[PDB]
Structure formats: structure tokens, C-alpha cells
Amino acid sequence: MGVQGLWKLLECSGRQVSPEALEGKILAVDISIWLNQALKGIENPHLLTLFHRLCKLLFFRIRPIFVFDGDAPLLKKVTGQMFLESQELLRLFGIPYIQAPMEAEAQCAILDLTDQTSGTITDDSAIWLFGARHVYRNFFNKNKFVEYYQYVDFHNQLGLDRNKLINLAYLLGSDYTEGIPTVGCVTAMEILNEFPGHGLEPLLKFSEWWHEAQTKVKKKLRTLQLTPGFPNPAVAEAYLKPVVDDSKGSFLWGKPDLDKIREFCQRYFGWNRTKTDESLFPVLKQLDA
């Protein structure tokens, strides 16, 4: 997912934060990535993963907002029952959620930019291209820490802004475009620095020069194979003006309903009161405290 290689390029701006430091923070969560990750990793694994991660989030007293994907963009190349079961569990835990118009990541980004949230929990590097400022990656991985990324930090460290990120998506490949073969981070940044310009002008100049010929960086730059339509401006316009809902929300966090969560866990996982309570009671004692 995301832009090929972008996280490794942003490595220099990553921070190690511990979950306890996120107490009280309102954070958005893209649940579609969870539902796909747990789909391939047991009868209801998506719901089991969702339950354990909800317990982890509420244990650290985070106030999460789950964001579901809507209609996929045409440029972008799993069941509704899973959506419904997930929303049922979220209501049982008292977690607000929203249905994105289209891209969930773009909606998380707009919640960030409108200061309705303190950031987004996701592993999708494409959220930077939608304008995100604060991202929490690898929240549930094998490490004892979450990776934290601030836009301003890698903007200062690397000079990357939204337009340069979109051009990197053109060069490296993303959900919306295939990217140029063999081109990696070093080559793509060489291309973007060789042809300075605002907006998409770097890639327009690069395509113009590659169509023309067909300098010691141009040496290998004119060995790349470019599609006839490169670059497709629909990609940049989808990244720059994604369909989102930028209205101010009215987010409320209710209290978890212990008995209905017991019933849910019994029906979907086969758990009795005791096994469910083993997971719930630390969460509840952290909340009521």
C-alpha cells in the first residue's frame, strides 16, 4: 500500500513513543486496513483483531475515532457483513465512527487538518499525500513502542511537501499509479531535483525532456521507459482535492456495555464470561480510574 519506499525515506523523522504517552488524545483509525490485515492472518479473525486492538486502545485511555472507507476512487486498483459486525462491536464499546465519502485516509487527514483529532493511527504512507500532519505507525507491531511522524519534521529534514510527495507517488508507484520501473527513492529524488518547479511542473519537464531525447544523472534518466500518458494529472488532482467531509463533527465516547460485549464475544468467538472478562476488566479499571 501507500507509496513504494516512502516510509523508509521518512525514517529519519520517525520517533519512538510509548502508548502511555497518548492518554486522552483523540486519534482517528482507518479500520479497512485492519480488516484486510486480519483477513489473511479461526472463524472471525477480523473481529478478534478488532476486539484486542480496541482493548489495547482503551487501556491506554486513547479516545479513538474509527473511519470506514467509502466508494473507492476510480484510479485506485472485505464484505459488508464485516463492516456491520465491526460497527456493532464499536457501538458496544461506545466508540464513535464515521463513514468516509471515499478514501478513509483522506478523511483522517481532513480530521487532522481541521484540528478535530491529534493525528491518525495507520500504516498507509498515502495519508501524507492527503495532507496529514501527525501519524502513528506500527501501533500493534512486535515493538514496545509506536512510531510517530510529524509532517513538519520531515519537511524540515527533507524539504518534502505535499506536491513533492505526489510527484514521488508518480515516480515510485502508489494505489493510483504504477510508477516508473527501476526508479527508487534516490532516482526519484534525483529526477525531482534535476527539474525544479512548482506543482506538477517537475514531472512535466521531465516527461518533456525524456520524450525529446530518447547530464550525468540524465545519463541514466533517459534510460527509463515512460508510458505515453505520463504524467496523468488525474492522479495529482485526486491526491490534492480528494472527496472528504470537512464539517465539524460531534464526536462522543460512551461507556462500554459489559453484558452485551459478553454476548458478542460468546456468539462470535465462543467465549464465556470469564475469558471475555480477562480482556475487559483491565480496560474497565483503566477507564473508571
Numbering used by the authors: 1 to 41, 50 to 85, 764 to 900, 912 to 986
Lines from the paper:
For crystallization, we introduced the D812A mutation to abolish the XPG nuclease activity. Two versions of the protein were purified that differ in the presence or absence of extra residues at the N-terminus. Both constructs retain the ability to bind splayed-arm DNA and were used to determine two crystal structures of XPGn in the free state, hereafter F1 and F2, with four and two molecules in the asymmetric unit, respectively. In F2 crsytals, both the N-terminal half of α6 and the entire α4 are disordered. The D812A mutation explains the absence of electron density for divalent cations in the active site, as this residue is required for metal coordination, together with six additional conserved carboxylates, i.e. D30, D77, E789, E791, D810 and D861 (red).
Nucleotide excision repair (NER) is an essential pathway to remove bulky lesions affecting one strand of DNA. The XP complementation group G (XPG) endonuclease cleaves the damaged DNA strand on the 3′ side of the lesion coordinated with DNA re-synthesis. Here, we report four crystal structures of the human XPG nuclease domain (XPGn) in the absence and presence of DNA. The overall fold exhibits similarities to other flap endonucleases but XPG harbors a dynamic helical arch that is uniquely oriented and defines a gateway.
